[PDB]
Amino acid sequence: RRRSWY
Amino acid sequence: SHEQFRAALQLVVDPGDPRSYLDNFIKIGEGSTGIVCIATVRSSGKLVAVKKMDLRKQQRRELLFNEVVIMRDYQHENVVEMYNSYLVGDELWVVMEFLEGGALTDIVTHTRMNEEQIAAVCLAVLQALSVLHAQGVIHRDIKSDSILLTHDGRVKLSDFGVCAQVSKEVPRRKSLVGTPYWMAPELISRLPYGPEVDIWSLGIMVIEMVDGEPPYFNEPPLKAMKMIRDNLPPRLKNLHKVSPSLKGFLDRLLVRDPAQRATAAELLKHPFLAKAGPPASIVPLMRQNR
């Protein structure tokens, strides 16, 4: 998965 | 509360609605903060890009200010220029430069890059970072998806929505931010950290550029982080496929101890960048030329 935390 | 936050952005964004001078919005992408559209400047016929971010959909809405800080304060040959920002309903819109060559991701997942091309990418990224780092800005989401290309192969850093600033009063950041496979070990360990995290993240992107994928990509995000945090630095799946100039370069980047990792500014002097070709060398890699 290429999705980012913030 | 949401209304409260709308009111705050309004004080900070440009007045009006860019729908009044743009036609033909066409969605071309997503990131984590929202969507990206192409639009047509009615009067010129030129293409610009438009980042739309729904306020109601952010984990941390206050990071949306990062977009304004950068526009206002850090603009540079290897950073995507932002032109103007607006509040349109419940959305923040950033009208910015359109990188018509797309993301590095599409290249890395469909062709092989030679070391001339790899080195040109790194050189361009490091020029961006050495300047940003010099002013206390840490991007915190370096990966191929954040690297965008012009039609003629110029390389620009993008997507600042989760960046932070350090300085003498705030020498370190602490927040858990980024994309799992790319996160530095000390940031997964919840240690305070500085610009060193972009350098590690860039190493992972070097491995993307070589293997097509970051390491432990076949593991779910949480297992990957544990292994990033607990294990020896991740290895190239194909070491016989990088010159020892590339292997040496990477060994300065994937360093566990953040105090021993090279900085952007040192890395600009690394012999491996001597191989960097002109932007024109990147051009054949794009979907429209393959």
Numbering used by the authors:
A (entry chain B): -3 to 2
B (entry chain A): 300 to 589
Question: What did the article's authors report about this structure?
Answer:
Most kinases in this group, including those in the mammalian Ste20-like (MST) kinase family, are Thr selective (Miller et al., 2008), while members of the p21-activated kinase (PAK) family are Ser selective (Rennefahrt et al., 2007). Here we show that a residue located in the kinase activation segment, which we term the “DFG+1” residue, acts as a major determinant for serine-threonine phosphorylation site specificity. To understand the structural basis for how the DFG+1 residue controls phosphoacceptor specificity, we determined the X-ray cocrystal structures of WT and F461V mutant PAK4 catalytic domains in complex with consensus peptide substrates incorporating both their favored and disfavored phosphorylation site residues (PAKtide-S and PAKtide-T). As previously observed for WT PAK4 in the absence of bound peptide (Eswaran et al., 2007; Ha et al., 2012), in each of the structures PAK4 is observed in the active state conformation with the activation loop phosphorylated on residue Ser474.
